[PDB]
């Protein structure tokens with residue numbers, strides 16, 4: 001069944017990859033096989049002299065540190081965000097906007113961006129006086145931990161995929177990866193969208209309409225918003241995929257709300273399985289978060305995010321129709 | 325000896341307290357005895373229902389987690405910053421401005437602000453790929469660690485000095501303490517000073533003559549700069565104290581530079597004992613960092629800090645006079 005696995009992976013460059021099928025066919029190794037394929041498609045293994053066995057050893061270790069008993073924030077989500085970022089990096093409006101190291105940073109960041117996620121929110125970890133919130137002083141608690149684990153795993157035997165990067169390349173990549181993953185904290189969404197909007201208004205492009213980003217500050221802001229868009233890309237995918245992602249996030253939400261109920265705390269929004277409307281929540285999610293973000297992105301890359309935006313608007317219409 | 329210690333602690337409200345003598349007379353417990361004295365002087369045990377045995381147990385545990393084998397960033401420095409903050413809080417321009425909870429936060433933040441300091445800089449920890457820098461993603465590495473340790477120690481046996489605060493009080497105190505200690509990161513000094521200058525330029529004074537601070541942002545900004553001033557107060561102290569602080573920081577700098585040299589790293593500024601001018605470095609420190617800060621603070625509380633600024637200026641003249 002490697003030939004159908006191979007056949008599914010030939011669409012690695014397409015929005016709507018069959019990531020769940022790939023997860024099943026690969027023996028629950030979608031992060032490993034999708035990351036491997038993307039590194040080959042972009043020729044990053046010999047651009048950065050990465051030994052293929054070191055790539056696989058690290059990826060398997062990284063994938064192992066995603067929890068198999070969390071419904072959403074697991075290795076399938078990691079693989080999906082990697083692949084969505086990979087596609088957004090190939091947006092024609094961004095042709096060669098980013099160096100090979102900036103490409104490598106966005107892809108690596110996507111792969112590690114949720115590693116060792118416990119399936120509960122930053123606010124839960126804060127309000128419960130968790131060890132993670134104590135270590136990180138209530139500030140981007142999960143995202144700081146995802147980075148620390150992602151980088152620490154490079155120190156395991158035969159796991160340093162960056163061993164042949166120069167010392168300046170490693171320092172630059174580390175900084176970019178940190179900046180990107182910290183930006184995936186949902187509490188920073190509005191600041192990040194405000195900066196994406198400012199870049200839209202002050203946007204400068206060539207005659208073909210390709211974006212011109214001269215400052216590193218602007219380029220990292222685009223990469224931050226890019227991985228944020230990929231993190232929030234479920235409602236923009238084909239509906240058969242999107243509905244599975246909704247099932248999984250609601251499982252996590254409800255199991256957290258149970259804990260907020262058993263411990264006796266205030267139940268987080270959308271986490272009370274006894275007073276939840278899954279469909280109304282998705283429509284509001286799209287209306288207030290996902291669509292404002294993806295329509296600003298589509299403008300920055302105008303008109304290249306039309307097919308993705310079209311799917312999102314189709315899916316919003318469908319979810320609304322499921323509300324009597 | 326306890327007789328003499330008690331007499332010296334009568335100076336706790338004065339700039340220029342004999343803090344090294346108190347460290348000796350107290351059996352190397354300056355942080356414990358000065359904190360206890362200040363808490364009694366401000367009636368904080370009664371106000372917050374702190375059991376005296378719990379306070380002493382926490383303070384001795386906190387003091388233990390300062391490194392007795394670092395020349396500068398030890399329990400004497402912590403005691404000095406605590407006492408300096410205590411004097412700055414009593415300045416006439418701030419009378420009745422801060423609540424008891426804000427006072428408690430500022431003093432507690434001062435006490436924990438360098439706990440478990442290893443005697444090397446954030447940049448050294450980043451450049452040597454330390455476990456601390458890996459934990460904290462190269463971002464305010466030491467200061468995040470000082471906070472995590474200072475809070476973690478409250479959980480040890482009979483150490484929760486905040487056990488009788490309301491949950492809302494504990495939540496507010498925790499956020500203020502985090503905001504204050506993170507502002508002691510020297511990489512934030514220029515932005516902190518820029519905002520303090522903006523506040524002085526726009527400052528408002530009540531009919532009572534005290535500073536008007538009517539929002540969290542302005543209130544925490546003043547406490548942040550207060551503790552940062554106390555942290556950078558050595559050159560404003562009587563010369564016999566200042567020179568001891570200079571001897572101690574230069575020992576730490578030179579030891580860090582010896583480690584950098586042996587590792588083949590670029591030696592940090594002022595850390596090369598074969599190429600250092602102690603006196604020129606102090607004059608530059610005053611001219612570019614300490615006097616800009618203290619002159620702005622003195623403007624905020626005018627004329628309360630005039631004697632402190634006069635001492636700083638005299639000490640700058642003294643060090644300058646040793647150069648030719």
Ligand SMILES: CCOc1cc([C@H]2Oc3c(OCC)cc(CCCO)cc3[C@@H]2CO)ccc1OC
Nearest residue numbers: 121186234245246249268269270281282285289
């Ligand atoms: C209806 C929302 O559906 C989704 C939400 C998300 C993420 O977005 C939020 C979020 O956004 C709030 C503005 C808030 C919390 C906190 C826990 C609940 O209070 C958690 C998350 C998720 C983190 O990855 C992903 C997919 C979703 O659907 C497929």
Ligand SMILES: CCOc1cc([C@H]2Oc3c(OCC)cc(CCCO)cc3[C@@H]2CO)ccc1OC
Nearest residue numbers: 445510558569570573577592593594605606609
């Ligand atoms: C001549 C400087 O004297 C002093 C400096 C300081 C602190 O201020 C800096 C700092 O600020 C810029 C100078 C930079 C580094 C990094 C290591 C050296 O590159 C370290 C420190 C110290 C941390 O507590 C305290 C007292 C001092 O004298 C009594």
Ligand SMILES: [Mg+2]
Nearest residue numbers: 113114142184
């Ligand atoms: Mg995340």
Ligand SMILES: [Mg+2]
Nearest residue numbers: 437438466508
């Ligand atoms: Mg410090």
Ligand SMILES: [Zn+2]
Nearest residue numbers: 077113114231
């Ligand atoms: Zn995610």
Ligand SMILES: [Zn+2]
Nearest residue numbers: 401437438555
């Ligand atoms: Zn300090």
